[PDB]
């Protein structure tokens with residue numbers, strides 16, 4: 294195909310993923326395993342409630358790792374925002 298169409302299909306697939314039964318289940322499994330604590334904060338010796346589960350390697354970078362628990366981290370907002378900025382340096 295053309296690059297634009299493949300990008301469109303990739304993005305539509307990623308959008309749908311977050312509505313999926315498998316994501317809903319896996320998100321809960323990760324939060325539960327993490328006791329709803331931000332994992333980056335914990336590494337920095339801080340206790341902060343997690344509000345989101347983020348892909349370490351972004352979903353749009355490696356579709357194959359979309360449901361891998363070792364590719365998922367519970368994060369607080371500050372750490373999610375920090376990671377989002379960092380990932381822009383990596384990927385755009």
Ligand SMILES: [Mn+2]
Nearest residue numbers: 331334369372
């Ligand atoms: Mn944090």
